[PDB]
Amino acid sequence: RTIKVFTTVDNINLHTQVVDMSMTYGQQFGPTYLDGADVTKIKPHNSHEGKTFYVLPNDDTLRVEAFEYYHTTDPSFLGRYMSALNHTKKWKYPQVNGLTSIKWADNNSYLATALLTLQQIELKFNPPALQDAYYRARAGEAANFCALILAYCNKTVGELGDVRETMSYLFQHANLDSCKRVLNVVCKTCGQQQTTLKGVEAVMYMGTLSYEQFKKGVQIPCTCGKQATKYLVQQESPFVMMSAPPAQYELKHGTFTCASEYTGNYQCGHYKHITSKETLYCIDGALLTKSSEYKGPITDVFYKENSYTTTIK
Amino acid sequence: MQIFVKTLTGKTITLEVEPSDTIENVKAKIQDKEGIPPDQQRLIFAGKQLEDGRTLSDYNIQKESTLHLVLRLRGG
Ligand SMILES: [Cl-]
Ligand SMILES: [Cl-]
Ligand SMILES: [Zn+2]
């Protein structure tokens, strides 16, 4: 006795299989999943006829397809993605003034903040998996995108998280190749040192939330023992992320794209997302509060950019 | 060679290091001196996040250079 089923690594390229109904999926395919559920130790059932099963790559065809879809060789990736998916399919993805959010569940506030952010910055994902899941997420069906973010960032459902770290890992999988940052450090004694950063390093900064302050100059130690001034010479990127340890900060309407608010301490906290539209919006999972002003403990601010050149001589 | 590491309180820490030391190596030296677990630590050089499995030489960090130690957030 046998049924036909489809095996896949990507849910786009399906491989017809004839499965011996007296053996477990595991003995026949290796590790096997059905709509996120692990069926490795399970024997084929009648109503499995015609259904699609994910399998761990166990041959050169599945290996190539897996790499082309996900851009990773981690053999733990599929199981981690499938484990997260069982939870993320149970979350609720409300539309909050045209953006997909997540209702609070399983310590997901950092994830909802990242998801809202990704819908507001210009980013091209390289892995087809992230490109496809992103478009579904933007339409309200974000479960696969959320499970992929957890898999790529090596996070488990319910684990506490850092938006800055989540954005950073996801940016490794974005086409930021042509993003460029030039910095100048001026010591009155030693002279001027210019540095060029590219890709992810060109769009991140940890130390100040203010894009304007980065342009104007920040005081840093010079190895001579004096204070030097560091300033942005040139920025070529569609956005910048400015981060700092969480601190009371005033967000002014029209002067930024969106921001992460972190309330709590280094053991436990809660993120809210602030975005600048016709007024200031504070999105807390499914809840939306509109205000003319906002002050709170901010840790990330995103600004839109194309090309900036300093006038500092 | 010595580097300096500024903590969130403004405490400055001296470490003994070598240009080929990985970031993980520097995190152990801070775990030794302050007892902070390496997994909580994030090392910053003049705004740039230093990543595990790159060296001080990779980032052109030289003697008398100052790093910043920040900690991962725990949002839920
Ligand atoms: Cl496939
Ligand atoms: Cl994309
Ligand atoms: Zn100097």
Numbering used by the authors:
A (entry chain A): 3 to 315
B (entry chain B): 1 to 76
From the study:
The Papain-like protease (PLpro) is a domain of a multi-functional, non-structural protein 3 of coronaviruses. PLpro cleaves viral polyproteins and posttranslational conjugates with poly-ubiquitin and protective ISG15, composed of two ubiquitin-like (UBL) domains. PolyUb and ISG15 have common other structural features: ISG15 comprises two Ub-like (UBL) domains and mimics a head-to-tail linked di-ubiquitin (Ub2). While K48-linked Ub2 (K48-Ub2) and ISG15 are similar both in sequence and fold, the topologies of how the two domains are linked are distinct.
We determined crystal structures of PLproCoV-2 with an active site C111S mutation, which inactivates PLpro, in complex with hISG15 at 2.98 Å resolution and with K48-Ub2 at 1.88 Å resolution. By contrast, for the PLproCoV-2:K48-Ub2 structures determined at much higher resolution we observe strong electron density for the proximal Ub bound to S1 site with only weak signal for the distal Ub in S2 site and no electron density for Ub in S1’ site. Therefore, there is sufficient room in our crystals of PLproCoV-2-C111S:K48-Ub2 to fit the distal Ub at site S2, but the binding mode of the distal Ub may be less defined. An alternative explanation is that PLproCoV-2 (C111S) can hydrolyze the K48 linkage slowly, leading to a mixture of Ub1 and Ub2. To test this directly, we ran SDS-PAGE gels of our crystals and observed predominantly Ub2 with only a minor Ub1 species. The structures of PLpro in both complexes are similar with an rmsd of 0.85 Å, but the binding surface contacts of the proximal Ub are shifted towards the fingers domain of PLpro compared to the proximal UBL domain of ISG15. This shift in the binding mode is manifested by a 21.7° rotation around the C-termini of hISG15 and Ub, displacing the N-terminal residue by 10.3 Å. The affected residues mapped to the binding interface in our PLproCoV-2:K48-Ub2 crystal structure, and the slow-exchange behavior is also consistent with the sub-μM Kd values. In the PLproCoV-2:hISG15 structure, E70 is close to S22 but does not form any clear stabilizing interactions; by contrast, E70 forms a long salt bridge to H68 and K6 in the PLproCoV-2:Ub2 structure that may have been missed by the in silico analysis due to the larger distance (>3.9 and 5 Å, respectively). Thus, we cannot exclude possible additional modes of interaction between the distal Ub and PLproCoV-2. This might explain the low electron density for the distal Ub in the PLproCoV-2:K48-Ub2 crystal structure.
